Amino acid sequence: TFFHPKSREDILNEEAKIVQALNNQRELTIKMHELKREEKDYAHSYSPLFSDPVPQGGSIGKAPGSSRE
Amino acid sequence: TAAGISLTGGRNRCFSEWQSFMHCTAKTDAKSRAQCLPNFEDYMECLHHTKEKARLREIESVLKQKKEGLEAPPVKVIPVKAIGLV
Numbered sequence A: 001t002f003f004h005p006k007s008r009e010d011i012l013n014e015e016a017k018i019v020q021a022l023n024n025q026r027e028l029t030i031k032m033h034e035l036k037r038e039e040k041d042y043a044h045s046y047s048p049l050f051s052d053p054v055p056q057g058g059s060i061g062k063a064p065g066s067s068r069e
Numbered sequence B: 001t002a003a004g005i006s007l008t009g010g011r012n013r014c015f016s017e018w019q020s021f022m023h024c025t026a027k028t029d030a031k032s033r034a035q036c037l038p039n040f041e042d043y044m045e046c047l048h049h050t051k052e053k054a055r056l057r058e059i060e061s062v063l064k065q066k067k068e069g070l071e072a073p074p075v076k077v078i079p080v081k082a083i084g085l086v
Helices: A008-036 B015-027 B033-048 B050-064
Strands: none
Touching (some): B015 B033
């Protein structure tokens, strides 16, 4: 009469919920690992404003024809 | 930054192909980046004149191994005082 354990079904349900949270963490973990290895845009990784990688050099003796795309 | 500025404030000697190569690297991605290896060899070539020196080496080597005469409008060296004489 003094033994009041939880029901077997409740134990299984609770452990299944815990394992589901654990698998969610495993998936988020693998996800972040993949996303860190993907490559970012030039604006996000180098410069948001002035997002053109192409330089323009010096402007004193600007020679017609020096521009090359 | 001073990249691209010559000793006189213009564009340095090797600007044009550098700018072409940057046009590449802007248009392409990391997977596609190998796509303009050619622009980069052109840049390094302007910088260091290596294949040009090699080509001149083969030309000189074959020239000095020749006893037959050369019939082509030649190159003449003049003193600096003689610029415009005659």
